[PDB]
Structure formats: structure tokens, C-alpha cells
């Protein structure tokens, strides 16, 4: 049972959780659930990044302490993930006591390696991005104020005696990493962008601040606070028992197998983060994957459902598993995507309610009121039965391949291809005709067709567990599958004839 450590980006709790956060949490949960069912030892970290000037300003604007905004908004972020049914092991917050020790530990490691030095910083700083920018990287507006060229965010002139990380010393050591291990950055398009960015030379990074005190204090220097990103990135270590490197959690889970992040914070994770770990003498994570953004088509406020970009609203409107499926199916993972009210409705009613819902319900109904509510004892299998079962048995292997990319959209395409095949099979065999017949060879065939249908929807249900936890559990309840037999190892064991089935009811309803 090999360990699998997966993390999400710990977002700033300065406002209301966006659709992008929910998209990330669902996507990461799907992989984390998939690995558990595939027999892995999974640690799954998520949470919030409560420090920084961005947080301190929003707290001062709302006239409350920074620590008060930290708890309140993190509680909101945590409840969203609870509503989204995220199976995280720990919801980390950078204000945690064990995180303070971990941030001070990695700092000491880097300083002892000789990568931290005191020097006066002079330059522009974006508070919205929590990011440093150079003179050329900024555009002087006709209004007078300065903005960051890339993001378009307002930048503030900063002149402080700060601590610097010798990032310029790791340029070629980072470029070798991308060449030797191309799997480090994903998708391929992101890696090439980072290669060209690092190829143009790297400048030293300021890693402490003095103008504010909302952040992790630098050891031996109370007047200095750690750069929010040095604080933020260390969470991935904290979530596995850092600074205790001898601990069971650290020796087993570190380095992380996958960092799940949005594409707007890729430089921090693929440039700064590995350089920090190289300096600290710690193993580098195996893969960082950046997903695209989800943008609304048309109007923000609907005339029937309300706010389209509100994650909580969509779950209340359409149902959790409906939203979970849509986001993972609609947009190819890694690319930017678009959605509207009709896109969700169409996908929910066609793919879930009809293609999967009705196939399951009709077959389970025929077993209930025509076959004594028990799995039919099948007869001899025909070429049609075998070919469909072969397409279903092949799923797990390719679904595993898609999930390792990660590419949840292709996995869902693969499963629906078989579900559609199961629907055409159901239409061709005509069980509703066969149940009316008096012939013994037609009655046994009716039992075989129903058994084959139940087996395909069982395999499908087992594989769809990471995507739709609640709905698939209720499907497997109706398919008489024991709770202690819902791992991917159970796919190889066919549904047992004579297994008692409870009264079937709709699980995927239309809108
Ligand atoms: C260590 S990942 C930090 C993510 C950052 N707080 C953001 O919201 O973009
Ligand atoms: O482009 P990749 O990194 O998803 O293979």
C-alpha cells in the first residue's frame, strides 16, 4: 500500500469563495478518492493562507482585527468544502501553531545553507497578487499610479531593509530539473512557459518584510515578518509533520505526489518552491499541475436560479454530484473553460438523469417487479453480452491512465461511451418484449440481458465514486453491493445472482 500525498492551493480568506476554488477542490477530491479506492495510502491537504498585506488591508477596511477575519472567513471556506463533500484529512490554516515552527524551520535551513542575506529592497509590490515586480514589468498609467503589466493590479513602491533569497544561484539547477523531470510541470504548455521564463535569468527574491507585523516572525529578528508566500508554501510540509523530519508522516508522504493549483500562481510553485526545497535540503514534489479558469457565459444573475458563479447556489439549485460531474466533464482539465445556466441543465438532464439514471432505474425496476427483487441468474452469454462486458472490464485500466495525468474529463468520456453502449444494448435486446413471451429460451434470455445490464452499471457506479460520492453510494445500495466491497478490486468480481435488491428509486432527477 504505497503512500500518495496530494494538496490543493491554500487560498486567501479575504472574501467569498469563488467558482475557481470549488473547481479545484472537487478536482483534487476526485483524484484523492480515486487513489484510495485503487489501494493507496492517501494524505489530502487543503486550507487557507491567512497572513499577508492583502488580508491585513481587508481586515482594516472592515474595521476588524486581522486574526478575526482569518477565523471567520476560513470557517466559510471550510464549510464550503464540507458542503462540496471534500474528503480532506486536514484543513490547514497558516495561523496554526505547528505551522509557525515549520516556517521557522525551513527559514533556518535556507539561512544555514547561506542562501539568505540582508539587503535593502527597492521596487514595486502588488498586494492583490502578493507578488514582486520590476520597473520594466510595470506600466505607468496616465492617471499617475503604477500597475503590474501582467495582472493589471495596482503596485506600491517599497523601500525596506529586507532579507533576500539567492534565487539567482538556482537558475541552471532549475532548468536541469525541467529537462530531467518534465513531469514536474503540467500540462506541457505550462512547462515550456516556465522554461523560457527561467532561461532569461532569475533575480533574487525578497523573503521578509518590516512595514507590517501580520505574518510569521523571522527567528532571531522580531522586527521582520516572513513573505506570505514563504509562509504559504511551507504548509505542504506542515501538513505532513514538519519540522519533525524523523516522524512517520514526513518520511512516508514527503515529497508530495501532486500539487493542484490554478495557473495564476504557477511561478511560485514551479520556480520559488523547488528552489526553497533545494536550499533546505529537502526532496522536491513529483508533479505540479495547473488547471484553467471557469468563466460565465452571458449574464451573472439568472432570472430563475440567481447567482450563476456562486458555488453554494449551484449546489442548492442543481445538487452536489450534478455540479461535481459537470465541472469535471465539461472543461478539459488544464485548459480554460466557459459555462452558463443551459450548459449545466443540458449536461445534468442528458448525461446523468437520462443516460445513467434511466438505464439504472429501468433495469432495476424490471428486476424488482418481474424477477422477485433479486439479481437474475443469467444463462449462456451471447457475443453481444460479451462485447459489452469487455468494454466495461477495460474501463479501470484506461480510467487509471486518465486520472494519473490528471484528465478526469477523458475518464468520464470513457465511462459514458460504455454507458451509451449499454443503452443501445438494452434497446436492441428488448427485455420488455422478452418478459411477455411464453418460451423458456426467451425467459432465460430476459434474465441474461438484465444481469448484463446490472453488471455494466455496477462497474460504472464503482468507477464514478470519486466524481459523485453520494449518488454512486445509493446506486450500489440498489445494486446490493456490500459497503466493505466498493474498492476497484471489486470490479473484477461480478455481481452475484440471487443477491437481494431494495426498492429502486430515482437518484438522478431532472431540473
Ligand atoms: C501555497 S498556495 C497559496 C495560494 C494563495 N494563497 C492564493 O490564493 O493564490
Ligand atoms: O501535458 P501533460 O503534462 O498533461 O502530459
TrEMBL record:
A motif ('HIGH' region) lies at residues 11-21. A motif ('KMSKS' region) lies at residues 300-304. Residues 375-511 form the Methionyl-tRNA synthetase anticodon-binding domain. Keywords: Aminoacyl-tRNA synthetase, ATP-binding, Cytoplasm, Ligase, Nucleotide-binding, Protein biosynthesis. GO terms for cellular component: cytoplasm. It is found in: Cytoplasm. Adenosine binds at residues 24, 262, 264, 293-294. The keyword Aminoacyl-tRNA synthetase applies. Transmembrane segments: none annotated. GO terms for molecular function: ATP binding; methionine-tRNA ligase activity. Is required not only for elongation of protein synthesis but also for the initiation of all mRNA translation through initiator tRNA(fMet) aminoacylation. Monomer. Belongs to the class-I aminoacyl-tRNA synthetase family. MetG type 2B subfamily. This is Methionine--tRNA ligase.
Amino acid at each position: 500500500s504505497e503512500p500518495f500525498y496530494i494538496t490543493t492551493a491554500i487560498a486567501y480568506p479575504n472574501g467569498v469563495p469563488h467558482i475557481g476554488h470549488a473547481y479545484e477542490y472537487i478536482a483534487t477530491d476526485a483524484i484523492a478518492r480515486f487513489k484510495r479506492l485503487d489501494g493507496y495510502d492517501v494524505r489530502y491537504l487543503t486550507g487557507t493562507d491567512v497572513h499577508g498585506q492583502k488580508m491585513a488591508e481587508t481586515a482594516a477596511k472592515e474595521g476588524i482585527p486581522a486574526a478575526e477575519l482569518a477565523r471567520r472567513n476560513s470557517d466559510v471556506f471550510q464549510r464550503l468544502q464540507e458542503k462540496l463533500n471534500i474528503s480532506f484529512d486536514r484543513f490547514i490554516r497558516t495561523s496554526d501553531a505547528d505551522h509557525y515552527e515549520a516556517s521557522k524551520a525551513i527559514w533556518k535551513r535556507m539561512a544555514d545553507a547561506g542562501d539568505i542575506y540582508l539587503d535593502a529592497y527597492k521596487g514595486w509590490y502588488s498586494i492583490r497578487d502578493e507578488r514582486f515586480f520590476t520597473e520594466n514589468e510595470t506600466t505607468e498609467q496616465p492617471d499617475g499610479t503604477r500597475i503590474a503589466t501582467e495582472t493589471g493590479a495596482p503596485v506600491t513602491w517599497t523601500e525596506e531593509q529586507t532579507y533576500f533569497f539567492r534565487l539567482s544561484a538556482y537558475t541552471d539547477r532549475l532548468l536541469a530539473l525541467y529537462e530531467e523531470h518534465p513531469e514536474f510541470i503540467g500540462p506541457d504548455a505550462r512547462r515550456n512557459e516556465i522554461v523560457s521564463f527561467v532561461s532569461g535569468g532569475l533575480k533574487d527574491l525578497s523573503i521578509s518584510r518590516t512595514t507590517f507585523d501580520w505574518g510569521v516572525p523571522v527567528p532571531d529578528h522580531p522586527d521582520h515578518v516572513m513573505y506570505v508566500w514563504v509562509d504559504a508554501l511551507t504548509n505542504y510540509l506542515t501538513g505532513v509533520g514538519f519540522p519533525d523530519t524523523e516522524s512517520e508522516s514526513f518520511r512516508r508522504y514527503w515529497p508530495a505526489d501532486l500539487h493542484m493549483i490554478g495557473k495564476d500562481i504557477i511561478r511560485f510553485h514551479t520556480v520559488y518552491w523547488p528552489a526553497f526545497l533545494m536550499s533546505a535540503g529537502l526532496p522536491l514534489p513529483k508533479r505540479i499541475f495547473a488547471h484553467g479558469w471557469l468563466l460565465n457565459r452571458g449574464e451573472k444573475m439568472s432570472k430563475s436560479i440567481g447567482n450563476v458563479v456562486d458555488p453554494v447556489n449551484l449546489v442548492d439549485t442543481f445538487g452536489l454530484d450534478q455540479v461535481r460531474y459537470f465541472l469535471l466533464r465539461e472543461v478539459p482539465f488544464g485548459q480554460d473553460g466557459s459555462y452558463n445556466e443551459d450548459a449545466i441543465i443540458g449536461r445534468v438532464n442528458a448525461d446523468l438523469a437520462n443516460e445513467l439514471g434511466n438505464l439504472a432505474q429501468r433495469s432495476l425496476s424490471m428486476v424488482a417487479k418481474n424477477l422477485g427483487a433479486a439479481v437474475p441468474d443469467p444463462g449462456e452469454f451471447t457475443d453481444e453480452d460479451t462485447a459489452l462486458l469487455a468494454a466495461a472490464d477495460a474501463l479501470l485500466e484506461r480510467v487509471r491512465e486518465h486520472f494519473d495525468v490528471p484528465a478526469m474529463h477523458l475518464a468520464l468520456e470513457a465511462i459514458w461511451s460504455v454507458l451509451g453502449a449499454a443503452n443501445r444494448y438494452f434497446s436492441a435486446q428488448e427485455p420488455w418484449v422478452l418478459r411477455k413471451s411464453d418460451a423458456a429460451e426467451d425467459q432465460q434470455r430476459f434474465r441474461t440481458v438484465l444481469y448484463t445490464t446490472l453488471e455494466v452499471v455496477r462497474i460504472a457506479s464503482l468507477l464514478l465514486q470519486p466524481v459523485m460520492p453520494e449518488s454512486t453510494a445509493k446506486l450500489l445500495d440498489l445494486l446490493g453491493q456490500p459497503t466493505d466491497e466498493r474498492d476497484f478490486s471489486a470490479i473484477a468480481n461480478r455481481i452475484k445472482p440471487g443477491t437481494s435488491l431494495p426498492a429502486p428509486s430515482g437518484i438522478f432527477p431532472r431540473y
